[PDB]
Amino acid sequence: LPDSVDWREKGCVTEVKYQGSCGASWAFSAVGALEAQLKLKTGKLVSLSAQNLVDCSTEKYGNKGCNGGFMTTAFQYIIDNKGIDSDASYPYKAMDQKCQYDSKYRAATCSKYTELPYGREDVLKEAVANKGPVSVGVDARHPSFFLYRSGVYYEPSCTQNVNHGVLVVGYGDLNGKEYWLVKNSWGHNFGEEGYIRMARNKGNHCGIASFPSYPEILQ
Ligand SMILES: CS(=O)(=O)N1CCc2c(c(-c3ccc(Cl)c(CCc4ccc(Cl)c(CNCc5ccccc5)c4)c3)nn2CCCN2CCOCC2)C1
């Protein structure tokens, strides 16, 4: 219902991360959403361990660490494992390590996650306004993505087949041109201090609505 949202206004979005040479965007997209539920439920913002996901959410979850994975099964790992460690206690090293999860430093839980209908930007808007930041994949394979600096991103070559996990933390328009507020994991020097505004309501542009999902911390 709100014509614009931005979850950084309510202190639900941590600092932008730098995934480096490790292909772990699924891990960063996942913790990003669970961080936002953790501030909602408890009132505390704290970065969750991407390294935990990479090191421990593996073959049983269909993931391959720095060579790809999925945000959905990363949520299933957190459910199964009954927790996830803080970034502070389990820092990211942009490489594949042995699982070193320590329940002592558990910072967040997961009760469930929810996948959204393919391509439904109306339904995606609802979840971002009513439930919190939503994990999505995008097609980020195109040179314009890499060269993105600011403004509303539109790429007529863009397809609906996604290949890069990111986090939708809000939405709006730029003098009418509508967009999704996307947090990426390429450090603050990428985009708009780490963010990219990608075209919204342009037929699932770059497949931002192809496979959305978001976790929940239930009471
Ligand atoms: C053809 S489809 O695309 O429509 N779709 C097919 C179906 C699908 C996709 C995703 C997805 C959602 C989010 C993301 Cl994040 C991704 C990433 C997939 C991916 C594909 C290709 C490459 Cl190279 C890379 C690696 N990234 C390289 C890269 C880096 C930087 C810029 C650009 C590229 C990643 C896929 N879920 N699902 C549904 C469930 C699939 N399974 C779930 C668990 O197991 C069982 C089945 C992709």
Start-to-end CA span in the chain (Å): 25
Q: Is the CB of 185 inside a 6 Å radius of any atom of ligand 1?
A: no
Judge if the beta carbon of residue 68 lies within 6 A of ligand 1.
yes
| Ligand 1 neighbour 64 (Cβ under 6 A) | no
Helices (H), 46-120: 50-56, 71-81
What spacing in Å lies between the alpha carbon of 162 and ligand 1's midpoint?
6
Sequence-ordered strand ranges (E) for the chain: 5-6, 84-85, 106-108, 112-115, 134-138, 152-153, 164-174, 177-183, 195-199, 213-216
Q: Could you say which DSSP state residue 173 is in?
A: E
| Gap from CA of 63 to ligand 1 centroid (Å) | 11
| DSSP 8-class letter at 87 | T
- Distances in Å between the alpha carbon of 92 and those of 48, 66, 88, 89, 183? 10, 11, 9, 10, 18
- For residue 109, what are the domain limits? 1-219
Kindly report the CATH number assigned to the domain that includes residue 2: 3.90.70.10
Q: Are 200 and 5 in contact (CB under 8 A)?
A: no
Task: Report which residue type is found at 197.
Answer: R
Site to substitute for ligand 1 among 26, 157, 163, 213, most atoms within 8 A of C-beta: 163
Give the type of residue at 80: D
Between strands 195-199 and 152-153, the pairing is parallel
CA 89 to chain centre: 21
Number of domains in the chain: 1
- The residue whose two tokens read 């994990």 is 135
- Integer CA distances (angstroms), 32 to 37, 89, 173, in order: 9, 17, 23
DSSP state of 20: T
- Name the residue at shortest CA distance from atom 46 of ligand 1: 62
